[PDB]
Design a protein around this ligand. Structure first.
Ligand SMILES: CO[C@H]1/C=C/O[C@@]2(C)Oc3c(C)c(O)c4c(O)c(c(/C=N/N5CCN(C)CC5)c(O)c4c3C2=O)NC(=O)/C(C)=C\C=C\[C@H](C)[C@H](O)[C@@H](C)[C@@H](O)[C@@H](C)[C@H](OC(C)=O)[C@@H]1C
Ligand SMILES: [Zn+2]
Ligand SMILES: [Zn+2]
Lengths: 157, 95, 105, 249, 53, 1114, 105, 104
């Protein structure tokens, strides 16, 4: 729902020793998918303590009590010598497509709110085939499909 | 579904613009005397629909048009003097 | 120019031709359907017109069906011109008059 | 000429490009010499008119043809000025309309004749004086300004003159400027002169037309603003029996 | 309903018509190789053939 | 993604460097790095040598000469960025070294003199003039020479035009009048020609010899025995007639000009003036029209044989023919360098006039150089040009292609070369001869159509400024490796072959060979041929050349697509198109909008702001990346790195991407899945339907930066001050401003919010007593200062990216008099698509987004994927932009076959090839289907059946093969997301490149009810809290008249504009809830009466019965 | 006569002319009631008229009356009428509406 | 009565001096430091009308019911503000005055 980057004061910034640039980073963080375990849960913060000459990688996030990053790999940042990264990224629960310019998350000064793609459901198709079952030759065979990010389960959905 | 029976209205007048001039002046008198002027009042009065429902239609123009096609109203080119038609109007709760 | 009153009260008019001359072959063709409506539709007949068993009272504002009727009465060799009130011959000076111009509001 | 240039050419009412020759009088045809210079004669017993043609002239009358006054002789455009004075203002009117529609028609447009008819009427709106009644005999005056001074100086207070006039073919723009109304005449380029001439003479407007009224921001004299309608008043039934109870006290 | 390219259907005649048009022209460019046609004359036909075609 | 090339014809030569016209001209007019001994005429050297041996009043008598020796260009006082930041012209000091001479001899070779400041070019091609980038656009005009032309005013006659190099001589016209007379025209003065001939020793006989023959035309030259007498006496009467007032015999003074010496008439040095007239006139010529100083007399050179040729052309020799004032053999380009040097020439000729005046004044033995030179003429003349001439544009910066286009722009209008926007028609038409030199597409639409134009791709401007195209040479049969750039003139001599023509190896392949000669298409023998085309590209402009299936696009819609691309706003996820013409690599590269390696080495430092690279020896360079800058157009151009920390480099491969660049391939928009069908009137007329799924993917979203400015001046009442202590204001208001009065970096800024605080003094009376008693007693003490800050204009705003401040006196900063300190604040926005945005493809399919549909709706393929845009078909056959269809089909292949393509113009994909790719692609798309365990569901069939009845499918074949066919045909069975059913009849679906354009609904659209009315006009404009009113034009008035709309019209002219009384009566009335006013007498009436009275003129009102009425009484 | 955002002014020109007049008028009112050499009133009455000129049709003669500074001719009582935005042409052309706005359709 | 015909004539010097209302025989007026005019000039409040909404200069009745407005040394009539566009001035010439329009 919202980020916060170390010495970064707006969306149109660029961190020293980071190849990326805050927009490209925000664009990446968009794709991270987090699982919630505790249904008591509503929102938390992942912490990206990241250092030096390395390739940041989403799995690099801080491990959290009841939280499961389902897309390790997935680029967050390329860091080159010196590059320090410290981040705090919010993760709320919600429905549908509610974008930054609407909700705006006020987690502190210079936070940046990010657009939200909430739906776990990824693609849905259904095939209406011809079954063979001792009545007519005029009966449907509905086979629904469904696709997710490992947070909600095809059946669960 | 345009305007309340607009074709039937043109028929009353000799020239298009008459209907326009009357519908104006009737809404004009209707406006001043907080609708206490109506010739259609009862359950003929025009209405709206809301988050509540059935509240009087604010548009004076609308009212004139429905009021006009009940025949009740009388318009004329020159019968009744204006200087005495202004004062006598304050008879049943004025402005 | 503004419609000032109905019936400037004049008897003048135009005769609108239903036949044409190409000035090259000295021939006489009955002019085009659209054009005849464009001469006659929504016009006020100047003096009475009779043809194909019908009679068109003077002052009839002649409808679209009317123009068709005339055209047909023109191929059936009965009418050639159509007498009709027009701004060209109106008497109101500072505009036209209802019974001239005619119709096409 | 064709297309939109031609539409202007007609309204502006100008000696056109390709001034096709028209017979001044009716008689017989007598084309002569197709080589050196080419010429068509129109002749009867009495009059005999000689029209000398460019050679490149696309005339379409063969020899010894009979002919009518004012009828085209060389093909192309008629100078609607030559037509007026040789066949009539009425006759000119019917030419113009017929000829404009010609362009609009042949490109593909349909629009009523009565439309063009109205404008052509204004192109004729004016007249020049011959032998005056109460002015100088050179003036250009509105046709029905000198109509009250024609069959009224003979309908009651008879005497002096009915005022003799001649028709004039003003070209739309030129028929624009020459208006009774100083107010609108002003908007145009030379504003001093209008206001000069106009002030010297008593000149009242009358605010007949539209432009005039708009200039002063007055309420347009048409539609809801036409005297014919604007005065209409409206009264209620209960209100009308509030006049039966108050007009005989 | 939609416009795919196959929908701009070419008549099977375009070929016949254009081979035909082609030759009546060959016999034209060879009718001026003789004293049969003037340039203006021959062109006035080449134009015209294509126009009918 | 991988790349598939298409079509034969390989290009014998790569494209020229593109920014050639611009860069490579100035350089050679500027001769910056060449020993001042070698420097050889034209450019700055020319203008110098043109004027310089400057003799004194009474030549070589009173001493003092002064002459040019050499010039030095300096080193620019400020950095390229320093200049833009501090509003400066990126300049250099041009000193010139001159020596002054006496009658008694001085060798005073004064140590250079400052002659003025000279602006100079970027590496890019552009200039910097007081901040802000600029483009000197290159102009075309008639080429110097002799011409003729027929008399348009006089049927069946001929004038004779003499044209020198511009601003170096006048227009001379000979024109035999319908009255015998011949008359020379010049300086807009017209005189009998004989006079000028009499001066050149032409007797009344030698005329009857060289100029009778053809007709009795000499009749009007001869009957003027009035002056066929004395040469000197001729000279006087001419002098008298031309420039009047002063009539003695020193006429030789004036007459020397338009005669000998490169004073004015130097039509050519070794250029066309002679060449042209030596080829179009009567052979044999030197330099100037008539040679004056021979041994005192004036000897003829051009005038007579012109008068001859004219005469031998009203009956005349066959082969004597009129001139084509339109042929590109008579149309030259004036490059930057030429126009600058032409303005540099104006400077000198002004400094000289000044120098001439001063030598006379001062004592001849005191005067040195530096003491004679002005240094303000040249400084001003060069200043005036770059800043103020119509040929000095801003800079089309929208995307990197735009800028490029802007350089290779050819104008017809402007200064000197002066075609008014109210002229020409054939001057607009595409001339046979534009072929290869100028694009026959890619012009502007309205009004300029034909007068503004772009340079053809392979084309190039030559020494004397004619455009030349490359043509391959053919040694009867063989097609050589040698190419020849030739004139439009040197071209009407050969049988040139199209590049379409086939070749077995390196020789022609068929007996009937297509070719043009002197323009008209001709089929020709393989031997007859004399040259070939290099590539079809040759023929069109760059933007034209960016259109994949141009083949099948109708020319007219192709121009719209050729444009618009210019209008493409750079996107966050820029992406080069799925189908290209190849050209997209190079357009990015030549634009220099993108970084590239210098000399194959190794990368070392790679972060957001820098790329530094250890080269092969060469030392070490760090390259900074411009990041989230702002275009001239608000575009927001920024660079992104595309290399890995530590890797070997490509001698010059992409180091970092541009703004519209994806991996060094021009990316002006996105590729996306489209359906070609109507929706529900949602793609009616030209509207487009969007899948909100686009927004989600941050697809068509772009960054735009606006900039705001505010000044500070001193005035009678005090100084305006950029304070932070704004009166009457909350701390809520100032929350965001540093101790200065300027907003912080990274503020979310809303409309109204304070951007820069500043306080004028203003002394609106002196606070009355009593109201100071209270002001003191209750505390709130009087103030001497007004609010007058900046604040964000209604609707604008976004996040505060950068601040910038220039105060009086700062290092190199000079700002306009009586102003001190300027503050600039930059705000940034992230945009996304919206209902009312304009999207277009390269085939010229424009249109606005009318509906973003949620994913639930939207046609979707059986596998599950929905489409991204629903484009109405009815907008196809009317225009003939058929390429857009062709391009979609391949894009369907590409989608499944997972590749990109390169189908160049008139040499790309052929249907069978696409179909084969489609066949290949379907075996996969259905390969998946059947592999994942599926096939032909009841819906698909329902369709297929009725599909063969339509006649698209083969009856007899199996539903599977039926599907394949239909697919291959570029079509497919589509499902309505809204109702699980299909649309009966298959729909064509694929990937299409589309761009989001310059214009956005965000920047358009306002609403006004009441707000700041002007203190000048008294109608609504100025918008300090809200926007400003729409205007009611004359045409809207007619319409209201044409309706019966009396009042509705009156309202628009009184209570809604200047009619203060009733204007206010209106507002009051509604606040209360009263039926508005009834403005009895309109103000504008009262204002009329009076303005008239103030001039006298009674002006008096009258009622019906006719007695004065009165409209005032107030 | 209205000021612009600061100390400086924006005058109405006709004032500058209604001023330049009473100026020359009183300096010829004063010059005549005490001490009248006729040679100088052949430079004072002549000079007064040419002020009453400016205030009517300033643009006349061949040398207009200019505001001391820029060569611009300054707009007169006649220039309040003639042409584009002058009170006659004005209502027929323009005026910005007070209850309005645009946007993409 | 209503308006039905504007009509143009010439102006008597007795017509002008009928419209006159005041007479501005006292020149230069364009003060800057304070947003008020200067003494009997083209911007005077006496001959023309009240500068602000009503208002004298030293302070008087800015009300309704009394009628007939002036003051002890500087009197400024009290009837609304649009008259600052309607109330005319007038200056008395020395002697002549050819009005260019009519001369040329
Ligand atoms: C001094 O420069 C001016 C000259 C005036 O004088 C005058 C008489 O001589 C002109 C010359 C010599 C041109 O070559 C020209 C031109 O090429 C052009 C337009 C008009 N173009 N538009 C068409 C449609 N549209 C919606 C907006 C603009 C012009 O009017 C002119 C033009 C004139 O009018 N344009 C085009 O057709 C094309 C192919 C592209 C334009 C791209 C962008 C938009 C512009 O280049 C921007 C970056 C600026 O450069 C201009 C705005 C200049 O304005 C300044 C001061 O920056 C202007 C040229
Ligand atoms: Zn009539
Ligand atoms: Zn006072």
């Amino acid at each position: 729902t919202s980020v916060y980057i170390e010495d970064v004061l707006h969306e149109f910034s660029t961190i020293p020793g980071v190849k990326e640039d805050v927009v490209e980073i925000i664009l990446n963080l968009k794709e991270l998918v987090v699982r919630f375990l505790d249904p008591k849960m509503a929102s938390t913060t992942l912490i990206l303590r990241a250092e030096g000459p390395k390739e940041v990688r989403a799995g690099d996030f801080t491990p959290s009590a009841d939280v499961e990053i389902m897309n390790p790999d997935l680029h967050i940042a390329t860091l080159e010598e010196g590059g320090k990264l410290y981040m705090e990224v919010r993760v709320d629960r919600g429905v549908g497509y509610v974008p930054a310019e609407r909700h705006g998350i006020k987690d502190r000064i210079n936070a940046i709110p990010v657009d939200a793609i909430f739906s776990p459901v990824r693609r849905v198709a259904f095939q209406v085939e011809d079954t063979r079952l001792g009545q007519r030759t005029d009966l449907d065979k509905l086979t629904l499909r469904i696709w997710t990010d490992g947070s909600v389960t095809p059946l669960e959905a | 579904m345009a305007e309340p029976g607009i074709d039937k209205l043109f028929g009353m007048v000799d020239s298009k613009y008459r209907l326009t001039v009357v519908v104006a002046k009737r809404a004009q008198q209707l406006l001043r005397h907080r609708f206490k002027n109506t010739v259609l009042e009862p359950e003929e009065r025009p209405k709206m629909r809301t988050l509540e429902g059935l509240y009087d239609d604010p548009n004076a123009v609308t009212w004139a048009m429905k009021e006009l096609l009940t025949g009740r109203l009388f318009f004329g080119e020159n019968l009744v003097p204006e200087d005495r038609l202004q004062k006598e109007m304050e008879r049943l709760y004025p402005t | 120019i503004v419609v000032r009153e109905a019936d400037c009260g004049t008897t003048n008019y135009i005769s609108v031709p239903l036949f044409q001359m190409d000035e090259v072959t000295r021939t006489l063709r009955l002019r085009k359907r659209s054009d005849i409506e464009s001469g006659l539709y929504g016009r006020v007949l100047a003096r009475e017109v009779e043809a194909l068993g019908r009679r068109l009272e003077e002052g009839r504002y002649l409808s679209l069906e009317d123009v068709h009727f005339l055209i047909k009465a023109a191929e059936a060799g009965e009418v050639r011109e159509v007498p009709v009130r027009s701004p060209l011959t109106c008497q109101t000076r500072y505009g036209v008059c209802q019974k001239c111009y005619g119709y096409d509001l | 000429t064709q297309g939109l240039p031609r539409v202007i050419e007609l309204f502006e009412a100008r000696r056109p490009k390709a001034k096709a020759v028209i017979s001044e009088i009716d008689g017989v045809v007598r084309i002569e010499e197709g080589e050196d210079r080419l010429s068509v004669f129109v002749e009867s017993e009495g009059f005999s008119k000689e029209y000398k043609l460019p050679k490149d002239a696309r005339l379409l009358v063969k020899d010894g043809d009979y002919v009518e006054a004012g009828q085209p002789l060389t093909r192309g455009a008629i100078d609607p000025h030559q037509l007026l004075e040789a066949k009539g203002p009425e006759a000119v009117e019917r030419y113009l309309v017929d000829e404009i529609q010609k362009v609009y028609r042949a490109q593909g447009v349909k629009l009523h004749d009565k439309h063009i008819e109205i404008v052509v009427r204004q192109m004729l709106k004016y007249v020049e004086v011959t032998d005056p009644g109460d002015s100088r005999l050179l003036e250009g005056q509105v046709l029905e300004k000198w109509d009250v001074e024609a069959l009224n100086e003979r309908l009651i207070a008879e005497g002096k003159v009915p005022v003799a006039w001649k028709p004039l073919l003003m070209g739309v723009t030129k028929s624009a400027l020459s208006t009774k109304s100083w107010l609108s005449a002003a908007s145009f380029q030379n504003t001093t002169h209008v206001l000069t001439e106009a002030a010297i003479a008593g000149k009242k407007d009358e605010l007949i037309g539209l432009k005039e009224n708009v200039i002063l921001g007055r309420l347009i004299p048409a539609g809801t603003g036409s005297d014919f309608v604007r005065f209409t008043q409206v009264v209620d039934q209960r209100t009308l029996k509030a006049i039966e109870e108050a007009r005989k006290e | 309903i939609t416009i795919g390219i196959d929908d701009a259907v070419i008549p099977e005649e375009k070929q016949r018509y254009l081979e035909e048009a082609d030759r009546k022209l060959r016999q034209i460019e060879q009718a001026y190789e003789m004293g049969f046609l003037t340039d203006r004359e021959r062109y006035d036909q080449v134009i015209q053939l294509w126009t009918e075609t | 993604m991988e790349i598939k090339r298409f079509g034969r014809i390989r290009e014998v030569i790569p494209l020229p460097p593109l920014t050639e016209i611009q860069v490579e001209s100035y350089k050679k007019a500027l001769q910056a790095d060449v020993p001042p001994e070698k420097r050889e005429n034209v450019g700055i050297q020319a203008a110098f040598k043109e004027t310089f041996p400057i003799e004194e009043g009474d030549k070589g008598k009173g001493g003092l000469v002064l002459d040019f020796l050499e010039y030095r260009i300096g080193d620019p006082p400020f950095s390229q960025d320093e200049c833009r930041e501090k509003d400066l012209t990126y300049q250099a000091p041009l000193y010139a070294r001159l020596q002054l001479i006496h009658k008694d001899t001085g060798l005073i070779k004064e140590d250079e003199v400052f002659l003025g400041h000279l602006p100079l070019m970027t590496e890019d091609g552009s200039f910097i003039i007081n901040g802000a980038d600029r483009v000197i656009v290159s102009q075309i005009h008639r080429s110097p020479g002799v011409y003729f032309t027929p008399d348009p005013a006089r049927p069946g006659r001929y004038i004779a035009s003499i044209i020198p190099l511009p601003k170096r001589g006048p227009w001379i016209d000979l024109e035999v009048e319908a009255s015998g007379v011949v008359t020379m025209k010049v300086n807009k003065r017209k005189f009998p020609l004989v006079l000028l001939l009499r001066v050149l020793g032409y007797d009344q006989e030698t005329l009857v010899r060289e100029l009778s023959a053809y007709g009795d035309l000499v009749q009007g030259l001869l009957d003027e025995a009035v002056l066929a007498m004395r040469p000197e006496e001729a000279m006087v009467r001419l002098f008298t007639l031309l420039r009047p007032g002063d009539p003695p015999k020193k006429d030789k003074a004036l007459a020397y000009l338009f005669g000998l010496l490169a004073d004015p008439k130097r039509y050519d040095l070794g250029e066309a003036g002679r060449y042209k007239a030596e080829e179009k006139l009567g052979v044999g010529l030197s330099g100037r029209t008539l040679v004056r100083f021979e041994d005192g007399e004036f000897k003829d050179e051009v005038f007579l044989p012109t008068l001859r040729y004219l005469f031998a052309l009203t009956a005349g020799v066959p082969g004597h023919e009129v001139d084509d004032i339109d042929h590109l053999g008579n149309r030259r380009i004036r490059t930057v360098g030429e126009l600058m040097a032409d303005q540099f020439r104006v400077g000198l000729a002004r400094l000289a006039r000044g120098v001439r005046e001063r030598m006379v004044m001062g004592s001849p033995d005191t005067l040195t150089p530096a003491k004679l030179v002005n240094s303000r003429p040249l400084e001003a003349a060069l200043r005036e040009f770059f800043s103020r001439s119509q040929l000095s544009q801003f800079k089309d910066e929208t995307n990197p292609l735009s800028s490029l286009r802007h350089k290779r722009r050819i104008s017809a209008l402007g200064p000197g070369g002066l075609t008014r926007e109210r002229a020409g028609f054939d001057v607009r038409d595409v001339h046979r001869t534009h072929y290869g030199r100028i694009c026959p597409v890619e012009t502007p639409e309205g009004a300029n159509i034909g007068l503004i134009t772009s340079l053809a791709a392979y084309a190039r401007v030559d020494a004397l400024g004619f455009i030349r195209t490359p043509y391959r040479r053919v040694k009867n049969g063989v097609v050589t490796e040698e190419v020849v750039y030739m004139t439009a003139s040197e071209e009407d001599r050969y049988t040139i072959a199209q590049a379409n023509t086939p070749l077995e190896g390196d020789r022609i392949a068929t007996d009937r060979v297509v070719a043009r000669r002197r323009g008209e298409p001709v089929i020709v023998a393989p031997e007859e041929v004399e040259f070939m085309d290099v590539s079809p590209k040759q023929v069109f402009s760059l933007n034209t050349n960016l259109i994949p299936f141009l083949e099948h696009d109708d020319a007219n819609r192709a121009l719209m697509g050729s444009n618009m691309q210019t209008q493409a706003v750079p996107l966050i996820r820029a992406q080069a198109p799925v189908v290209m013409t190849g050209l997209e690599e190079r357009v990015v590269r030549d634009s220099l909008a993108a970084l590239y390696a210098e000399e194959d080495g190794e990368v070392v430092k790679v972060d957001g702001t820098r790329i530094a690279v250890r080269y092969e020896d060469g030392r070490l360079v760090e390259h900074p990346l411009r990041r989230y800058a702002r275009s001239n157009q608000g575009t927001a151009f920024d660079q992104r790195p595309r290399v890995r920390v530590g890797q070997r480099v490509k001698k010059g491969d992409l180091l970092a991407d541009g703004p519209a660049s994806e991996e060094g391939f021009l990316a002006l928009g996105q590729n996306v899945l489209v359906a070609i069908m109507p929706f529900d009137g949602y793609n009616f007329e030209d509207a487009i339907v969007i899948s909100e799924e686009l927004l989600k993917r941050d697809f068509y979203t772009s960054i735009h930066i606006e900039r705001y400015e505010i000044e500070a001046r001193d005035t009678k009442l005090g100084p305006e001050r950029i304070t932070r202590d704004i009166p009457h204001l909350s701390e809520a208001a100032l929350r965001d401003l540093d101790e200065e009065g300027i907003v912080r970096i990274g503020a979310e800024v809303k409309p109204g919010d304070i951007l820069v605080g500043r306080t004028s003094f203003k002394g609106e009376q002196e606070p009355s007593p009593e109201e100071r008693l209270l002001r003191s007693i209750f505390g709130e003490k009087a103030r001497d200062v007004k609010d007058t800050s900046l604040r964000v204009p209604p609707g604008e705003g976004g996040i505060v990216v950068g601040r910038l401040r220039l105060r009086r006196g700062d290092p190199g900063v000079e700002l306009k008099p009586g102003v001190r300190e300027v503050v600039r604040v930059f705000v940034a926005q992230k945009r996304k698509l919206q209902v009312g945005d304009k999207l277009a493809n390269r085939h010229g399919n424009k249109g606005v987004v009318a509906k973003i549909l949620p994913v639930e709706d939207m046609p979707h393929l059986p596998d599950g994927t929905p489409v991204d845009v629903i484009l109405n078909p009815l907008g196809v056959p009317s225009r003939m932009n058929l390429g857009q269809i062709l391009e979609t089909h391949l894009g369907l292949a590409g989608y499944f076959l997972g590749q990109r393509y390169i189908s160049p113009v008139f040499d790309g994909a052929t249907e069978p090839e696409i179909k084969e790719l489609l066949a290949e692609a379907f075996n996969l798309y259905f390969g998946k289907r059947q592999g994942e365990g599926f096939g032909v569901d009841k819906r698909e069939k329902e369709v297929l059946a009725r599909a063969e009845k339509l006649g698209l499918v083969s009856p007899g074949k199996s539903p599977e093969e039926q599907l394949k066919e239909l697919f291959d045909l570029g079509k497919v069975v589509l499902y309505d997301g809204r109702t699980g059913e299909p649309f009966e009849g298959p729909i064509v679906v694929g990937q299409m490149f589309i761009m989001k354009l310059y214009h956005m609904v965000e920047d358009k659209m306002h609403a006004r009810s009441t707000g700041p009315y002007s203190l000048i006009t008294q109608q609504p404009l100025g918008g300090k809290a809200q926007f400003g009113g729409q205007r009611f034009g004359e045409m809207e008035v007619w319409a209201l008249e044409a309706y019966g709309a009396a009042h509705t019209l009156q309202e628009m002219l009184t209570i809604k504009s200047d009619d203060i009384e009733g204007r206010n009566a209106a507002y009051q009335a509604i606040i209360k809830g009263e039926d508005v006013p009834e403005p009895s007498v309109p103000e504008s009436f009262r204002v009329l009466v009076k303005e008239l009275q103030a001039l006298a003129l009674d002006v008096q009102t009258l009622d019906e019965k006719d007695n004065p009425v009165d409209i005032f009484e107030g | 006569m209205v000021q612009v955002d600061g100390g400086r002014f924006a005058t109405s020109d006709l004032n500058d002319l209604y001023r330049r007049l009473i100026n020359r008028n009183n300096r010829l009112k004063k010059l005549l009631a005490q001490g009248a050499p006729e040679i100088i009133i052949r430079n004072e009455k002549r000079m007064l008229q040419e002020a009453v000129d400016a205030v009517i049709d300033n643009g006349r003669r061949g040398s207009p009356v200019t505001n001391p500074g820029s060569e611009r001719p300054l707009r007169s009582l006649t220039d309040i009428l003639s042409g584009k935005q002058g009170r006659f042409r004005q209502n027929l052309l323009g005026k910005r509406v007070d209850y309005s706005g645009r946007s993409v359709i | 009565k209503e308006v039905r015909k504007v009509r143009i004539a010439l102006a008597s010097p007795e017509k002008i001096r009928s419209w006159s209302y005041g007479e501005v025989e006292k020149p230069e007026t364009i003060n800057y430091r304070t947003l008020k005019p200067e003494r009997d000039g083209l911007f005077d409040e006496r001959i023309f009308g009240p500068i602000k909404d009503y208002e004298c200069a030293c302070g008087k009745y800015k009300r309704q019911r009394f009628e007939g407005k002036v003051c002890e040394r500087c009197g400024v009539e009290v009837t609304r503000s649009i008259v600052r566009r309607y109330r005319m001035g007038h200056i008395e010439l020395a002697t002549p005055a050819a009005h260019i329009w009519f001369v040329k």
